[PDB]
Design a protein around this ligand. Structure first.
Ligand SMILES: [Ca+2]
Length: 392
């Protein structure tokens, strides 16, 4: 039964856009519909975050905070100076001013969005010691996000998240395939990549870096410039955070709050080969992933980097082994779901036979009851108790 009234907030990964972008083709629902609308219609108040898809988890968290409470994005003086980007970004009206009033939220995140959510919670709770100290030594102002003490998040749900990174980033032609992936997503929403569209369409939100598609520039050309930009070349990027070392690093500081519930969902759309031990993509997997990404993910081994046979099963984009929760360089606890949702630990809700894009409806899958998946999820989050009790 309903035990809390917190609103649900949806969060995307290395790909994603606002509800008004892509001519309305939703990241959350894709060809299958509108996930946010489905939840709202069924009585679970739901909102959508849109943040920089290629940006670091840190930038994304700063953007999320501001998008939630309202205001101008504050990346932190120490952080901005450390990476040579702007300190202030876009201004948001704020989706949930109630947060400043004691309200809470459930975050449902997909792909890299899971890392962002974890980071958000950490910053909210603990702030940033480095930002606090930089503020004091330089006499610069400080965003509340870096103070700590905030309690807005009742839970975090991650779906197909690379908590321990994805081996996809080790592909020699990663840079080109990655951007071709973006092109495939554009293709899914019936948008061409060789057309200099005058409407926005897909805003990558690179205010901090001063980058944006110009008049007369198609996505193809825009991506060519991005590839040579700091959002692809720096350590303050999705590219880095998505990597096995980059993830481990993030895990070294981004910890599970003992005040928040965490749910994890894994995905797989592969089959094992008997003679090679490798994993192959199943019939139905989004075409781009099956041809370009899956073969690699299910065959790439690296002993020195710790990548072995447990890393081969994948969802076409991320290794399944990486989803149940942070493990590399982490102190977080992961617990297999036993009918009871524990606090401050990762509740491994299992593995689902869906690919990276089918799970959000971007790639069709008629055997996947997407509406029921999310409704079941919403009902489960709504049943979370704001404070459980110790019993026999
Ligand atoms: Ca499919």
């Amino acid at each position: 039964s309903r035990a809390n009234d917190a609103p649900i907030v949806l969060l995307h990964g290395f790909t994603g856009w606002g509800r008004e972008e892509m001519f309305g083709f939703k990241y959350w629902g894709g060809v299958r519909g509108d996930i946010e609308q489905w939840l709202n219609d069924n009585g679970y108040r739901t909102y959508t975050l849109a943040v920089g898809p290629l940006s670091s988890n840190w930038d994304r968290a700063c953007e999320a905070y501001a998008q939630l409470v309202g205001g101008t994005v504050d990346y932190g003086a120490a952080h901005a100076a450390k990476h040579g980007h702007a300190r202030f970004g876009r201004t948001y009206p704020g989706l949930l001013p109630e947060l400043k009033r004691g309200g809470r939220i459930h975050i449902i995140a997909h792909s890299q969005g899971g890392q962002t959510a974890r980071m958000l919670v950490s910053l909210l709770e603990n702030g940033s010691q480095e930002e606090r100290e930089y503020a004091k030594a330089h006499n610069v102002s400080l965003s509340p996000l870096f103070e700590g003490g905030h309690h807005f998040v009742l839970s975090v749900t991650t779906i197909a998240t690379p908590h321990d990174g994805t081996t996809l980033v080790n592909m020699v032609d990663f840079t080109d395939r990655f951007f071709d992936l973006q092109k495939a997503v554009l293709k899914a929403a019936a948008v061409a990549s060789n057309v200099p569209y005058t409407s926005q369409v897909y805003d990558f939100k690179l205010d901090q870096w001063g980058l944006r598609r110009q008049p007369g520039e198609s996505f193809d050309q825009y991506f060519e410039r991005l590839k040579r930009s700091p959002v692809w070349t720096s350590t303050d990027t999705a590219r880095y955070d998505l990597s096995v070392p980059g993830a481990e690093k993030l895990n070294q500081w981004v910890k599970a709050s003992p005040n928040t519930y965490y749910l994890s969902f894994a995905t797989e759309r592969t089959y094992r080969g008997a003679l090679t031990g490798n994993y192959y993509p199943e019939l139905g997997m989004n075409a781009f992933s099956a041809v370009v990404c899956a073969p690699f993910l299910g065959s790439y081994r690296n002993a020195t980097l710790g990548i072995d046979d447990r890393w081969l099963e994948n969802d076409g984009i991320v290794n399944a082994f990486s989803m149940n929760g942070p493990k590399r360089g982490s102190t977080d606890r992961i617990v297999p779901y036993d009918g009871t949702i524990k606090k401050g630990v990762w509740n491994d809700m299992g593995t689902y036979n869906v690919d990276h894009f089918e799970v959000i409806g971007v790639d069709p899958n008629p055997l996947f009851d997407i509406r029921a998946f999310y409704l079941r999820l919403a009902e489960q989050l709504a049943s979370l108790q704001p404070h459980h009790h110790h019993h026999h």
